[PDB]
Amino acid sequence: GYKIRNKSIFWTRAGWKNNWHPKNFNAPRPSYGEFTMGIRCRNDHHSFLRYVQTYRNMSRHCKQYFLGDKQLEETFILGLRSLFLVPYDSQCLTDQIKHGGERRFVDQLDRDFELISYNTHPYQLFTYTVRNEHLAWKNEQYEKIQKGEKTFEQELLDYLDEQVLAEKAKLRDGQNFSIERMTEIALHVFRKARAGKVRPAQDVRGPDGNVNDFLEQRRPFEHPNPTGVTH
Amino acid sequence: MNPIQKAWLKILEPVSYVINEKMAKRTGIIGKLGRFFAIGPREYGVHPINRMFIFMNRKYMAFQAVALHR
Amino acid sequence: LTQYVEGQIVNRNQLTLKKQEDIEQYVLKLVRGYFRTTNKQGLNINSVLQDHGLDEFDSIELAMQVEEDLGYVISAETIPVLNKVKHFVNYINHVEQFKAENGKAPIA
Amino acid sequence: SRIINHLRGDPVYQDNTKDVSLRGTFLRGKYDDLPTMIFFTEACDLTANWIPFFTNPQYDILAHRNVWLLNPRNFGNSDRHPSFDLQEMSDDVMRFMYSQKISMATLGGHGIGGKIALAVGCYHAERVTGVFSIDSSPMDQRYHEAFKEFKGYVNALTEINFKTWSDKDVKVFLKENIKDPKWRSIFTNNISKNAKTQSDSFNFEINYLNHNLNFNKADSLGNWAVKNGIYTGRAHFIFPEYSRWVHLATNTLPMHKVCARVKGFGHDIFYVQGDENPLNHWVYDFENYANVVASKLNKFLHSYDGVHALLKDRTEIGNFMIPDRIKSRNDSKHIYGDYSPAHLHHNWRFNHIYEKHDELDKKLN
Amino acid sequence: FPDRGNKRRWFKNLFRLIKNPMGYIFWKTYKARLAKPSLIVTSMFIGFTLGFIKLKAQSIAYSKKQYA
Amino acid sequence: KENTGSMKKPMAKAYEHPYNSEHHPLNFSAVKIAETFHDFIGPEQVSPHYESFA
Amino acid sequence: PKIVNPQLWPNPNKLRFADLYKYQGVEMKKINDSIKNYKAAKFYIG
Ligand SMILES: CCCCCCCCCCCCCCCCCC(=O)OC[C@H](COP(=O)([O-])OCC(O)COP(=O)([O-])OC[C@@H](COC(=O)CCCCCCCCCCCCCCCCC)OC(=O)CCCCCCCCCCCCCCCCC)OC(=O)CCCCCCCCCCCCCCCCC
Ligand SMILES: CCCCCCCCCCCCCCCCCC(=O)OC[C@H](COP(=O)([O-])OCC(O)COP(=O)([O-])OC[C@@H](COC(=O)CCCCCCCCCCCCCCCCC)OC(=O)CCCCCCCCCCCCCCCCC)OC(=O)CCCCCCCCCCCCCCCCC
Ligand SMILES: CCCCCCCCCCCCCCCCCC(=O)OC[C@H](COP(=O)([O-])OCC(O)COP(=O)([O-])OC[C@@H](COC(=O)CCCCCCCCCCCCCCCCC)OC(=O)CCCCCCCCCCCCCCCCC)OC(=O)CCCCCCCCCCCCCCCCC
Ligand SMILES: CCCCCCCCCCCCCCCCCC(=O)OC[C@H](COP(=O)([O-])OCC(O)COP(=O)([O-])OC[C@@H](COC(=O)CCCCCCCCCCCCCCCCC)OC(=O)CCCCCCCCCCCCCCCCC)OC(=O)CCCCCCCCCCCCCCCCC
Ligand SMILES: CCCCCCCCCCCCCCCCCC(=O)OC[C@H](COP(=O)([O-])OCC(O)COP(=O)([O-])OC[C@@H](COC(=O)CCCCCCCCCCCCCCCCC)OC(=O)CCCCCCCCCCCCCCCCC)OC(=O)CCCCCCCCCCCCCCCCC
Ligand SMILES: COC1=C(OC)C(=O)C(C/C=C(\C)CC/C=C(\C)CC/C=C(\C)CC/C=C(\C)CC/C=C(\C)CC/C=C(\C)CC/C=C(/C)CCC=C(C)C)=C(C)C1=O
């Protein structure tokens, strides 16, 4: 559709696409023992173990609020690894970062853990909201199954299995019911089912099969436009 | 909608009956008068002042967190 | 000593192995319980966790589980050397010997 | 066979501009009931060339609408009349829609076809849902170099006399007089031999066309007159980045000048990223140009075409209420308020869907 | 006939400005504010406007001095 | 055999944070400020007329 | 409280037109979240 035309878009004074060691005037220079009296530096060799304990904490402190949900603990682990694997899989040469990428990332994860220790990290609150909406939908299915009723998900599967039989009973010249064909059949049903939610199926017409719904409508007397004027 | 609007409705329950059931559906100027002063939920009933506070409160509070978190 | 399990509070139980045969069985049951492990039946005492879909971050989750089942306090300096089933077996023994001789748990 | 159905007829020279009938190919849609699309090809250009574009599974345009690849007067198989007035040529479409029982249609065009399509919306807007113009603009193009060449080639074609000239004499004439490969191929395929091999002739009326172009006045097809007015409905324009017909610098302003609802570049006006090549006018040949045109076309048909002006998209149908002007309704005891405008069925006039659904509604109550 | 739909349009816009002036001003000036001038120009506008208001206030005070 | 399948009982609910709500979100972002802003200036004032007011 | 309807026009069906009936509730839902904060602050203010 549209591609960047400038060939020098990824150029920097430090090279092509260099986001690990941008060029600056005060560049790193070596130190010689025989000539060095004293030095003030914060770099150390403790980042590896801090990278290990930070993982153990962020994992164990997040599981406190999972309520033993095993499927959530395993999902969270996959998400936690995606956060720790950024330096190992990125295009950025994390081993060539200015003053040590190891210390940089470890200090960054420590700020995330601090918020995790208080249960205030946006990833935590997002996991709770996402999970509660998921269980409310799973419990709705359970309540309908205990009553012997059919779920809206099973009705689609059964309606799709029979449509496949109808379409392949006429596909005799060929015998390759491709995954492409199986897909467009399901999407066509989805689009009609998707529109059915807002406009349910009253009669044999089916979901969203009434033209009168699209005639001129008006807000109800009990719910007028609260945000602006109407005329 | 808010509790204060619901209080008006309980107090204006008989007034709502006179204007809406009787007047609003008549013809002539009595109907135009009832349909104009019909009682119910407010069209464009939002309060910009209350909405202004909410916006500036949220915008200024995010500034507090940056300035205080040092 | 209680933890949630599928929304229900359950009392946690700790184990005391004090025997070589019981350790090899616990580690395998532990490693086979991890959802990331591949070829669970091909796993033996001389199995490299790397050959079963496990990386450095998975060894931490396994060690974290050893603390839950045994009550140990494993330091971050010891976790990154646990890359084989044999390593968990020997580390568990070294801890039992340390507490049996020194009367205390190793430095965490 | 089934998907491809082109009615067959013979052109008839007409003295009255109202007794003109249009003929073209019809492409049936995948689904039973779909709105119709009427597409006008470039002048002197074949309708068949657009069939693979509208019958490509990758694009899947027929899933949205039935397509009528229609020929304007003096072109192809349609009737012949010396006048090219866009008002007259627009009335021709309205009779076609009537004879074919089409209440309202989506209009499209390529190049000069886009002008013809937009003119119909300007003269008959209540029966046009939208316009989709490809490498065209409602503008005077008489002095564009690309048009001059087309205007020049048509004049050279008037020199050939099929009765005396032999088949080889023609082929040599085209190669030397026509440098553009595509125009050359287009003109060759427009040559046909009538029944009984009486003689060969062009499918399009070469005489009536050359006079329109050579005269080079307001009635010329290159010209866009102020008489055509304004188009009130939905309009989307797509043209190549480097196009000889529509220059991005200034040839976009006519769209705002003629189309009232055109928002501007990036919403209703797009350019396809491409290189400088005089053949970019024919987007259907190059996959890169076509894939973008198709995607934009499917988006226009799915979300924007046949949608009320003040509504953003089709998503807002039934949930967005338009303000009402005071004293706009006959009922005096009417409490004026916001309303969702009525969107009707695409062929509600020639069917009884409203009468049928009214009965079903009563059965519910 | 006239365009009876435009009746009382000035009164109606006045009441909408009173209801929510910042919203009425915001949307009526949106397309114009898309082209924002420089910080210098914006500052000159504010500076000259507030300075004119400051002198207006001093002239109001000098009138109370003439009344006294 | 597939038709004979059943479904296990899922958990009733996950953790509900006692200090985060949809109207008073605990953490800050420009997204929530945008919602409060457009609620203040109101939605786009769409004109039904054929000419501008001025 | 019940609101008197002049019944000059028929109201849209809630099932077919649901979005039209939502704004009222979310508005009170906002106020309830504010009240939870007013009550939780009884000890801090006191
Ligand atoms: C025997 C003794 C008798 C004693 C009694 C004597 C009394 C005689 C009565 C007989 C006179 C009336 C005759 C009947 C008229 C019928 C005509 C008709 O059909 O309707 C036309 C007229 C048409 O209006 P429309 O078609 O609906 O729409 C208007 C347009 O859309 C235009 O609206 P727009 O939105 O587009 O904006 C433009 C508008 C508004 O433009 C403006 O900006 C003007 C705004 C004026 C008001 C504000 C002034 C500013 C100062 C105040 C600030 C307020 C705003 C502040 C905001 C907040 C600030 C922070 O322009 C107008 O001025 C509209 C006026 C209506 C047109 C008439 C021709 C006017 C031309 C002359 C203009 C100059 C006069 C202005 C008079 C005020 C008009 C409202 O409708 C009427 O107004 C009818 C009025 C008749 C009412 C009679 C009621 C009963 C009278 C008796 C009661 C007792 C009186 C006792 C008096 C005692 C002695 C003092
Ligand atoms: C032209 C150049 C020169 C301009 C010079 C300056 C112009 C005047 C400046 C006045 C500024 C005062 C601001 C007051 C606070 C406003 C704060 C606010 O958040 O605004 C929303 C605020 C509404 O928030 P709300 O309280 O939640 O009410 C919403 C409810 O839903 C409402 O429920 P509802 O929808 O059912 O009600 C219908 C609605 C629509 O109906 C109407 O408003 C139309 C008819 C209203 C009557 C005509 C107004 C006459 C003046 C009012 C009385 C004298 C002053 C009172 C003190 C006002 C100052 C607070 O009514 C309203 O909009 C609100 C009520 C209007 C006030 C009426 C009562 C007045 C007495 C106040 C008693 C309480 C205060 C205690 C006394 C204070 C004195 C010690 O608006 C107002 O309340 C009134 C604002 C008036 C502004 C008019 C002019 C604004 C534009 C000036 C442009 C300046 C040029 C520069 C522009 C540059 C552009 C490029
Ligand atoms: C109740 C109290 C009543 C008394 C007070 C009444 C006050 C009424 C004022 C109401 C507002 C004025 C009308 C504005 C219309 C709406 C905005 C607008 O213009 O549309 C945008 C449109 C273009 O702006 P744009 O589309 O955003 O494009 C700009 C680019 O985005 C980016 O920029 P660019 O790169 O393209 O070019 C650089 C930049 C150039 O930089 C500038 O913008 C120049 C402004 C620098 C600051 C000037 C000082 C601030 C003035 C207000 C404070 C007054 C001080 C006290 C006055 C004491 C003496 C009375 O261009 C601009 O951004 C806009 C300049 C266009 C002129 C703006 C309108 C005139 C200035 C405002 C008039 C103020 C009158 C107040 C008193 C009047 C008393 C009768 O402007 C035009 O309408 C074009 C008109 C042609 C303007 C050029 C020729 C003008 C020659 C006459 C000059 C008159 C000077 C008056 C001096 C006053 C006394 C010292
Ligand atoms: C490590 C390296 C250094 C890193 C430093 C870190 C930098 C961090 C940047 C942080 C950015 C903050 C973002 C938030 C603010 C954004 C909002 C904004 O207003 O930006 C303007 C923003 C962007 O404007 P723009 O059109 O894109 O132009 C951008 C630039 O101006 C460019 O325009 P241009 O391309 O046309 O360039 C021409 C330029 C040409 O300038 C020149 O060629 C030379 C300038 C020579 C200045 C000579 C000064 C002489 C002073 C004499 C005074 C003597 C009196 C002293 C009194 C002593 C008493 C004894 O002239 C100007 O642009 C004038 C701009 C005014 C600048 C005022 C500050 C000047 C010094 C700042 C020093 C900061 C340290 C930098 C060190 C770098 C050293 C290498 O304007 C807006 O449109 C937003 C609304 C603004 C409404 C007006 C009211 C705003 C005031 C409130 C703002 C918010 C609170 C205060 C913030 C600070 C404001 C100063
Ligand atoms: C006791 C009796 C006393 C009371 C008596 C009662 C009288 C009460 C007066 C009320 C009058 C009725 C109120 C009607 C609504 C307000 C007036 C209006 O024109 O609204 C429609 C006007 C546009 O009409 P439209 O057709 O509906 O809009 C179509 C498009 O959407 C618009 O955008 P577009 O680009 O798509 O279409 C074209 C657009 C092209 O033109 C424009 O868009 C204008 C460009 C302006 C935006 C450029 C950026 C500058 C704005 C930045 C924001 C700064 C202010 C906020 C920051 C500080 C916070 C306060 O509009 C035009 O066609 C030309 C503009 C209209 C003619 C020029 C009017 C200039 C003055 C208006 C602004 C007032 C300046 C302050 C003066 C007050 C001094 C204190 O709305 C506005 O542009 C802004 C309205 C803000 C007005 C506030 C002042 C209200 C007082 C009105 C009194 C008359 C003006 C006195 C000033 C005299 C200086 C020469
Ligand atoms: C603490 O952290 C902070 C914030 O939160 C993060 C901030 O937002 C901010 C920014 C501040 C804001 C966004 C607030 C902005 C408010 C400003 C500028 C002032 C607002 C002024 C008004 C809205 C006008 C109010 C006018 C009146 C109340 C007078 C009219 C009402 C009258 C006369 C009623 C009588 C009232 C009383 C007797 C008071 C008793 C109280 C009641 C609630 C009784 C109510 C009774 C009834 C019948 C409703 C800061 C600085 C901050 O520090």
mmCIF file with all atom_site columns, C-alpha atoms and ligand atoms in Angstrom, chain B residues 4 49 52-58 60-62 64, ligand 6:
data_model
loop_
_atom_site.group_PDB
_atom_site.id
_atom_site.type_symbol
_atom_site.label_atom_id
_atom_site.label_alt_id
_atom_site.label_comp_id
_atom_site.label_asym_id
_atom_site.label_entity_id
_atom_site.label_seq_id
_atom_site.pdbx_PDB_ins_code
_atom_site.Cartn_x
_atom_site.Cartn_y
_atom_site.Cartn_z
_atom_site.occupancy
_atom_site.B_iso_or_equiv
_atom_site.pdbx_formal_charge
_atom_site.auth_seq_id
_atom_site.auth_comp_id
_atom_site.auth_asym_id
_atom_site.auth_atom_id
_atom_site.pdbx_PDB_model_num
ATOM   1  C CA  . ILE B 1 4  ? -31.183 14.733 42.189 1.00 0.00 ? 4  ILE B CA  1
ATOM   2  C CA  . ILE B 1 49 ? -18.799 22.156 34.688 1.00 0.00 ? 49 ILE B CA  1
ATOM   3  C CA  . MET B 1 52 ? -14.597 20.079 33.219 1.00 0.00 ? 52 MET B CA  1
ATOM   4  C CA  . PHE B 1 53 ? -13.521 19.247 36.767 1.00 0.00 ? 53 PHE B CA  1
ATOM   5  C CA  . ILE B 1 54 ? -13.218 15.555 35.903 1.00 0.00 ? 54 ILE B CA  1
ATOM   6  C CA  . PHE B 1 55 ? -10.921 16.354 32.981 1.00 0.00 ? 55 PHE B CA  1
ATOM   7  C CA  . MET B 1 56 ? -8.680  18.817 34.813 1.00 0.00 ? 56 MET B CA  1
ATOM   8  C CA  . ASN B 1 57 ? -8.608  16.556 37.869 1.00 0.00 ? 57 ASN B CA  1
ATOM   9  C CA  . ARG B 1 58 ? -7.364  13.627 35.798 1.00 0.00 ? 58 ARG B CA  1
ATOM   10 C CA  . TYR B 1 60 ? -3.470  17.512 36.891 1.00 0.00 ? 60 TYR B CA  1
ATOM   11 C CA  . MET B 1 61 ? -3.326  14.285 38.890 1.00 0.00 ? 61 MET B CA  1
ATOM   12 C CA  . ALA B 1 62 ? -1.139  12.583 36.292 1.00 0.00 ? 62 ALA B CA  1
ATOM   13 C CA  . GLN B 1 64 ? 1.312   15.026 40.449 1.00 0.00 ? 64 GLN B CA  1
HETATM 14 C C1  . LIG H 2 .  ? -5.539  17.067 45.970 1.00 0.00 ? 6  LIG H C1  1
HETATM 15 O O1  . LIG H 2 .  ? -5.005  16.907 44.693 1.00 0.00 ? 6  LIG H O1  1
HETATM 16 C C2  . LIG H 2 .  ? -5.450  17.847 43.761 1.00 0.00 ? 6  LIG H C2  1
HETATM 17 C C3  . LIG H 2 .  ? -6.438  17.430 42.678 1.00 0.00 ? 6  LIG H C3  1
HETATM 18 O O2  . LIG H 2 .  ? -6.895  16.114 42.624 1.00 0.00 ? 6  LIG H O2  1
HETATM 19 C C4  . LIG H 2 .  ? -5.968  15.266 42.022 1.00 0.00 ? 6  LIG H C4  1
HETATM 20 C C5  . LIG H 2 .  ? -6.928  18.443 41.650 1.00 0.00 ? 6  LIG H C5  1
HETATM 21 O O3  . LIG H 2 .  ? -7.693  18.117 40.810 1.00 0.00 ? 6  LIG H O3  1
HETATM 22 C C6  . LIG H 2 .  ? -6.424  19.878 41.715 1.00 0.00 ? 6  LIG H C6  1
HETATM 23 C C7  . LIG H 2 .  ? -6.919  20.881 40.680 1.00 0.00 ? 6  LIG H C7  1
HETATM 24 C C8  . LIG H 2 .  ? -8.238  21.494 41.137 1.00 0.00 ? 6  LIG H C8  1
HETATM 25 C C9  . LIG H 2 .  ? -9.354  21.350 40.456 1.00 0.00 ? 6  LIG H C9  1
HETATM 26 C C10 . LIG H 2 .  ? -9.426  20.558 39.158 1.00 0.00 ? 6  LIG H C10 1
HETATM 27 C C11 . LIG H 2 .  ? -10.620 22.003 40.984 1.00 0.00 ? 6  LIG H C11 1
HETATM 28 C C12 . LIG H 2 .  ? -10.922 23.240 40.155 1.00 0.00 ? 6  LIG H C12 1
HETATM 29 C C13 . LIG H 2 .  ? -11.982 24.046 40.896 1.00 0.00 ? 6  LIG H C13 1
HETATM 30 C C14 . LIG H 2 .  ? -11.987 25.364 40.904 1.00 0.00 ? 6  LIG H C14 1
HETATM 31 C C15 . LIG H 2 .  ? -10.941 26.189 40.160 1.00 0.00 ? 6  LIG H C15 1
HETATM 32 C C16 . LIG H 2 .  ? -13.083 26.095 41.668 1.00 0.00 ? 6  LIG H C16 1
HETATM 33 C C17 . LIG H 2 .  ? -14.418 25.538 41.206 1.00 0.00 ? 6  LIG H C17 1
HETATM 34 C C18 . LIG H 2 .  ? -15.538 26.453 41.662 1.00 0.00 ? 6  LIG H C18 1
HETATM 35 C C19 . LIG H 2 .  ? -16.775 26.160 41.344 1.00 0.00 ? 6  LIG H C19 1
HETATM 36 C C20 . LIG H 2 .  ? -17.086 24.909 40.528 1.00 0.00 ? 6  LIG H C20 1
HETATM 37 C C21 . LIG H 2 .  ? -17.893 27.083 41.794 1.00 0.00 ? 6  LIG H C21 1
HETATM 38 C C22 . LIG H 2 .  ? -18.600 26.478 42.992 1.00 0.00 ? 6  LIG H C22 1
HETATM 39 C C23 . LIG H 2 .  ? -19.640 27.481 43.467 1.00 0.00 ? 6  LIG H C23 1
HETATM 40 C C24 . LIG H 2 .  ? -20.388 27.203 44.506 1.00 0.00 ? 6  LIG H C24 1
HETATM 41 C C25 . LIG H 2 .  ? -20.215 25.867 45.231 1.00 0.00 ? 6  LIG H C25 1
HETATM 42 C C26 . LIG H 2 .  ? -21.420 28.231 44.955 1.00 0.00 ? 6  LIG H C26 1
HETATM 43 C C27 . LIG H 2 .  ? -22.813 27.807 44.519 1.00 0.00 ? 6  LIG H C27 1
HETATM 44 C C28 . LIG H 2 .  ? -23.335 26.710 45.440 1.00 0.00 ? 6  LIG H C28 1
HETATM 45 C C29 . LIG H 2 .  ? -23.893 26.993 46.600 1.00 0.00 ? 6  LIG H C29 1
HETATM 46 C C30 . LIG H 2 .  ? -24.038 28.447 47.048 1.00 0.00 ? 6  LIG H C30 1
HETATM 47 C C31 . LIG H 2 .  ? -24.405 25.840 47.463 1.00 0.00 ? 6  LIG H C31 1
HETATM 48 C C32 . LIG H 2 .  ? -23.987 25.957 48.925 1.00 0.00 ? 6  LIG H C32 1
HETATM 49 C C33 . LIG H 2 .  ? -22.780 25.061 49.193 1.00 0.00 ? 6  LIG H C33 1
HETATM 50 C C34 . LIG H 2 .  ? -22.456 24.718 50.426 1.00 0.00 ? 6  LIG H C34 1
HETATM 51 C C35 . LIG H 2 .  ? -23.281 25.198 51.616 1.00 0.00 ? 6  LIG H C35 1
HETATM 52 C C36 . LIG H 2 .  ? -21.242 23.828 50.681 1.00 0.00 ? 6  LIG H C36 1
HETATM 53 C C37 . LIG H 2 .  ? -21.660 22.500 51.311 1.00 0.00 ? 6  LIG H C37 1
HETATM 54 C C38 . LIG H 2 .  ? -21.343 21.370 50.329 1.00 0.00 ? 6  LIG H C38 1
HETATM 55 C C39 . LIG H 2 .  ? -22.248 20.646 49.690 1.00 0.00 ? 6  LIG H C39 1
HETATM 56 C C40 . LIG H 2 .  ? -21.711 19.564 48.751 1.00 0.00 ? 6  LIG H C40 1
HETATM 57 C C41 . LIG H 2 .  ? -23.760 20.844 49.865 1.00 0.00 ? 6  LIG H C41 1
HETATM 58 C C42 . LIG H 2 .  ? -24.492 20.629 48.541 1.00 0.00 ? 6  LIG H C42 1
HETATM 59 C C43 . LIG H 2 .  ? -25.963 20.991 48.717 1.00 0.00 ? 6  LIG H C43 1
HETATM 60 C C44 . LIG H 2 .  ? -26.816 20.827 47.725 1.00 0.00 ? 6  LIG H C44 1
HETATM 61 C C45 . LIG H 2 .  ? -28.282 21.194 47.928 1.00 0.00 ? 6  LIG H C45 1
HETATM 62 C C46 . LIG H 2 .  ? -26.347 20.282 46.378 1.00 0.00 ? 6  LIG H C46 1
HETATM 63 C C47 . LIG H 2 .  ? -5.434  20.296 42.798 1.00 0.00 ? 6  LIG H C47 1
HETATM 64 C C48 . LIG H 2 .  ? -4.923  21.731 42.873 1.00 0.00 ? 6  LIG H C48 1
HETATM 65 C C49 . LIG H 2 .  ? -4.949  19.282 43.821 1.00 0.00 ? 6  LIG H C49 1
HETATM 66 O O4  . LIG H 2 .  ? -4.182  19.610 44.658 1.00 0.00 ? 6  LIG H O4  1
#
